[PDB]
Design a binder for this molecule. Structure first.
Ligand SMILES: C[C@@H]1O[C@@H](O)[C@H](O)[C@H](OS(=O)(=O)O)[C@H]1O[C@@H]1O[C@H](C(=O)O)[C@@H](O[C@@H]2O[C@@H](C)[C@H](O[C@@H]3OC(C(=O)O)=C[C@H](O)[C@H]3O)[C@@H](OS(=O)(=O)O)[C@H]2O)[C@H](O)[C@H]1O
Ligand SMILES: [Ca+2]
Length: 260
């Protein structure tokens, strides 16, 4: 059984030209509020591999909601942010991911697509008014299909992370490789963003974004814990500067705790 889009890559389709960002189906199984900024597809679900999957498909140039030539297309769900900075504060997302395709431009720095991200505002200015903290970006790995064609067969997952609050661009962010996953392989995902007691320090605090991907932990401390005011997560599909991205999410859960 299959839920993969295989037709030509186009910018918009009727079935995906939603009138508002909050266009959703009745009773979605994925948790969180829909934020649909792509006219290629809408959120929908499929029943396969013994699970119910939310379907996040976006294509290059399909953002009919943001002002043109600004932000990339996306279909995401946003989760209530943890608006506290005490140790023990966290946002915790869990789910099962399938990757079927990501964007590709032929150059690493503009290739790949995000399936989740950690974000949170900070004091003191710097960057955009709703700044990213780090995003989890999947890049294509090609191989043969069995008939002499190069196609996406696996995906290198990298973390695009801030060097400093609100950082963007070559100077503002660094890319860290995490691990490879196979096309259509079911991957357990956990992402927890939060504040904890700093051991190397007293009564100071660390702001972290710790992921578990297919059983392996990738932990990371956010720069300048003291400037951050909240922890937030979004997931789905975001960024496709060439071609198409297709993410599948099953059994999503979200918890948070706010501790001062
Ligand atoms: C800032 C956004 O943050 C998140 O939301 C998300 O990761 C997003 O990624 S995205 O979905 O792929 O878009 C981030 O968006 C990128 O933000 C960059 C930014 O800092 O605003 C954008 O880069 C800026 O603009 C670039 C054009 C510039 O790159 C130089 O400029 C030109 C050009 O005008 O011809 C081309 C080349 O990009 C490069 O020569 C960036 O400069 S830098 O060299 O990287 O430091 C930067 O000014 C980026 O386009 C957004 O996608
Ligand atoms: Ca849509």
């Amino acid at each position: 059984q299959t839920d993969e889009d295989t037709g030509p890559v186009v910018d918009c389709t009727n079935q995906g030209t939603n009138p508002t960002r909050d266009t959703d189906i009745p009773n979605p199984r994925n948790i969180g509020d829909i934020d649909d900024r792509s006219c290629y597809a809408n959120y929908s679900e499929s029943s396969i591999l013994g699970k119910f999957w939310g379907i996040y498909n976006i294509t290059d140039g399909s953002n009919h909601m943001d002002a043109p030539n600004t932000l990339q297309p996306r279909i995401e769900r946003s989760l209530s942010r943890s608006q506290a900075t005490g140790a023990g504060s966290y946002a915790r997302f869990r789910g099962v991911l399938r990757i079927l395709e990501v964007g590709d431009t032929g150059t690493f720095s503009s290739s790949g697509s995000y399936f989740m991200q950690a974000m949170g505002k900070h004091t003191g200015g710097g960057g955009s008014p709703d700044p990213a903290i780090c995003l989890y970006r999947a890049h294509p790995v090609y191989g043969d299909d069995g008939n002499g064609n190069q196609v996406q067969v696996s995906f290198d997952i990298w973390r695009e992370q801030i060097n400093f609050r609100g950082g963007s661009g070559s100077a503002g962010r660094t890319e860290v490789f995490l691990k490879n996953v196979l096309k259509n392989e079911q991957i357990d995902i956990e992402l927890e963003v939060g504040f904890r007691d700093d051991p190397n320090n007293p009564g100071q605090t660390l702001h972290y974004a710790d992921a578990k991907i297919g059983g392996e932990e990738f932990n990371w401390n956010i720069p300048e814990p003291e400037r951050g005011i909240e922890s937030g997560i979004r997931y789905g599909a975001y960024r496709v500067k060439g071609g198409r991205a297709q993410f599948r999410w099953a059994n999503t859960s979200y918890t948070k705790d706010e501790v001062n």
